[PDB]
Write a protein that binds this ligand. Sequence first.
Ligand code: CH1
Ligand code: CA
Ligand code: CA
Length: 1203
Amino acid sequence: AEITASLVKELRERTGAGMMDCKKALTEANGDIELAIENMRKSGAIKAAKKAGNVAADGVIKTKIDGNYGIILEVNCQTDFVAKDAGFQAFADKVLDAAVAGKITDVEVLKAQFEEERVALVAKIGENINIRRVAALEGDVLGSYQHGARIGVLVAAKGADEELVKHIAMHVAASKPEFIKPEDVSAEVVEKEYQVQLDIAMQSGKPKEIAEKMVEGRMKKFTGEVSLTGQPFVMEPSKTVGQLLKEHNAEVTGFIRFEVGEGIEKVETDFAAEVAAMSKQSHMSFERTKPHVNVGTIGHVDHGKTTLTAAITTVLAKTYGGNTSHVEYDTPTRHYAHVDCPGHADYVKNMITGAAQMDGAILVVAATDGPMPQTREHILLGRQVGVPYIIVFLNKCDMVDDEELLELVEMEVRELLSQYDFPGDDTPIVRGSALKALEGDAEWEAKILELAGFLDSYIPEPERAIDKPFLLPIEDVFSISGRGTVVTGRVERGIIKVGEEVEIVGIKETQKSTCTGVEMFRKLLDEGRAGENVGVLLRGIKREEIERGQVLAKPGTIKPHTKFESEVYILSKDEGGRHTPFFKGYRPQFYFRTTDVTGTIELPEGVEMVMPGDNIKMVVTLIHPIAMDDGLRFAIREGGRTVGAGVVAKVLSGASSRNSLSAQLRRAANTRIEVEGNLALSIANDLLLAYGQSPFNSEAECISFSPRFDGTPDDFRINYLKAEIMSKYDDFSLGIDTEAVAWEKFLAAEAECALTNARLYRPDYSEDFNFSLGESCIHMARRKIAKLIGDVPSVEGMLRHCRFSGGATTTNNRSYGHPSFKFALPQACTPRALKYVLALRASTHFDIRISDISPFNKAVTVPKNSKTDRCIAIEPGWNMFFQLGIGGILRDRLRCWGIDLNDQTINQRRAHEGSVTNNLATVDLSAASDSISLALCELLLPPGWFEVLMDLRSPKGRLPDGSVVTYEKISSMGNGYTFELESLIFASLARSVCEILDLDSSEVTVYGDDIILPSCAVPALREVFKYVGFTTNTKKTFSEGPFRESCGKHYYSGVDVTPFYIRHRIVSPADLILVLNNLYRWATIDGVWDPRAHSVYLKYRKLLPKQLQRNTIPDGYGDGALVGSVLINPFAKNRGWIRYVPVITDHTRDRERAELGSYLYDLFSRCLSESNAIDQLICRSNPTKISRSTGKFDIQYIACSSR
RNA sequence: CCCUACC
RNA sequence: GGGUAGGG
Ligand SMILES: Nc1ccn([C@@H]2O[C@H](COP(=O)(O)OP(=O)(O)OP(=O)(O)O)C[C@H]2O)c(=O)n1
Ligand SMILES: [Ca+2]
Ligand SMILES: [Ca+2]
């Protein structure tokens, strides 16, 4: 030590400067006060200027109004915590006040007027802080709005009143209008923006006056929207600000809106990979049940928070050897995840959103400085979020002589901790140095060790989910004959044993009962443990006495509540939340463990708008009760869209839409649009005419017209539509057309397999002399396939993939398709398939029974296009169960070849590229799956597999004639695996063809029979295919020309030319709406019409009942309303800040579900799962419900977003 | 279970 | 009938 302790303290208390900066400026002053205060004052700048190269993207905005003069101010800092800090508040509160009277606008004037004090803080704080901008606004009446501190606006308007200007100010803060009027936009920035779009359009091939008109309409919008005037007013999106003003005899002379940080990079920051980055410099020179603990580090930016967590990691690895960007380290007794808390808001967000909780914080302060002024806000954050314990790591202690000085810093911290109710006197404080720790220096190494010892002993072990009291969120209820009432769900915490009593609590008056049993799909059980999906059997209680959403718990452990206060986060436009703010009476859905429930909120004191993206405390009150205690997470929803997360803080005491309007629409909806002749045709023809193309001569021409594959994209697009649009229409009288042809087709395919079956089992030409491409590919493909697939389908493979889903089986019809009827009604099965069923039956205690054992499937017929139906096959139920098993497994394996059968999106893009690039082809086989013969499978597949495939197929088929077929092909369409099998067969060949040619196999991609490989490969692929029995569809395969198609998307030199189809007689208003919407989506660029089509759209829109002509919804909400602008829908009711619009839906009648079967289906599904930012983990999946379609329509109200 | 869009 | 994506 040099000079004395209490000499430095009073140097701090009158300055706020760092400890060592105080001692060291007290030596060069020979123990003199005033002399010292000066060496620092006179060095205030050396510090500040050292911080210039520190990005200050945070801060506050302030705002003041004087009679009718107003100023808006922005002064940055680099941190959340500094912005809410008292001192920094006072600087900006002052630089603002004294900037009012002294009416300034030149940012430099008031800057330099404060520069000598701007250095005061920057020294005392340790963050770059400085005035960023200022501006001034005056008018006849101006008003301001302050959205916390992140954003303020000043609004000046003539002829307006008090609240009006507030509201306008608030709107401005929400909608960011970059001008005050549509006619105020830089007639240059625009006149040259109209000069860029004109190509985008005229290069797509569009005729002069079309590209123009389009661009004009676009630009008219492009502006109206970025202009206060043509902006849907925020407090009533139905009318815009423009109209709001006009009807108040007012206008807006001008406005300013500032937002903290606007246009300042705000350099990204990754925590983990930075620690490893600081760990790298000294990178140089069983018991799995261990408890899991979350810790957060919190303190001043460069007080060494990052170096400490580096230290904590090396040292811990060196010694005890071994969500979202978070380092993790181990102690001999527990396992840690560690986050940084660089921002206050940002942290509160993650704490609500569950993306990062905290069992204890670690407050980091460098002893060379001591607590900073903003250290208050650090501890305060801890306090506000309820971090249960806070440990202190004094850092950089080695850069300190007097040890009495550390005794002194440590006092300051303890006193701060206690000012915020933390155990100041009893809280751990390790005197350490992270730097030396990383230099291996074992003196300062045992302090890190010591810190982790406190982590192990001061932050108490968190409560293992099993040790808390039983609770199971009820997902569904079943009435099971001779086994009472049963609920299913995942037990959330605790254990339930048979015999114990339970309460069922939530939505109605709480009820009591006792546990009869506990079952999973395979085992029956006497206890259910936390994390397990189960059924639990209750006694005396009935199934209409229990609802989903209730919980099952140990008695008295959980109680039902209706009112509570909470901390919630509203998602932004980004995260898929709302895109408009809400206000006083927000009335959304609060989803709890498994169900939505309506609630109203009240905002805290003095807040009256809420924007996507921000935090808020609100007092929520629910329509009826839900079991809850403190801590319980919940989502916030609007029509099943997630717009917020929440956490109950404290439970409290808890002491639009029109009917005739629905009736009007219902009546209209059940009306018949009726016209003469064929409406579909008339529409197509008015369309052909508006694009100036010759109309369809007759019904005959609709289905026999071929497009010219040339001319401009525009010319081709309507030409392609002409060829496709009527091609699947099912109501053509004119034609002895049929489905007789579908069977001929079907018989042709079989006979084809018969030939190639003969051939492939006979290729003894008895002459090696000759070598063949097809032979070669089969050999190569076989070898690749085995490497991918294995000798045989894994048992686990089957365990996670066999399932029932869907439609008809050989015993169930469309009506009894649902999986719950498959578990209830006995299913048929094949003699060869029997052992699978028995094995499944040996596998569970539930009954598993076989209607009948027979080798037949049912060949039926389903619609395809105007020219032919498609023959498929309805399988035996149990065979299906297992087919989907192997089908599911092949789907997984095929990923290793880059083939992803869940994503037809990758095939569409390669179609599009092949379209400009001509380097890729799209190809198509004719009877794709009807042509895979038995022989081909047998040559390609491992024996183990082919056998399993032979057991599971239907060997025989019963046609509608009662006649039979003994199948030549391996499997028919409608089998559980044929799609995935044809994909693998197709890919394996194309890949082998690639290697034979020295192309990259990886360029191959396949989805069913939509095959995409490199163009040069096609001729050889054609030959292989011909050889192994397939016939390639010359008409729908493209390896040159400007055209490509794959998976629904059609492209022409890069432009989307995918058509649309009218399939049915248009008879109801839903039929017509669907067609019109398809027209809309095909003719609209971003909501703007091609004029050619729009004239036809408007012509036919007049055929609808009047109210249905105006009842519009945004795109992506379905087709029970015309797509258009929902803001101008007269029937849209804005109810509680969420907007509700009526759509047409099919009127259903409820049917009785199969109680046992539904319960198996539920349980079986939970089995399937066990073998398998983000608050999506807050929602489940829903209860079995059956319903008949009556032929009528209903009106349903759905939630919408302005869009 | 009932609608639309595709293989 | 099988699968995909979206909707109730
Ligand atoms: N409604 C459909 C459509 C396709 N697929 C499956 O996807 C593959 C694609 O067959 P398509 O290309 O649609 O037509 P193909 O049966 O091969 O007959 P074609 O091209 O001559 O019309 C084959 C089949 O397994 C299906 O099962 N059911
Ligand atoms: Ca095909
Ligand atoms: Ca195809």
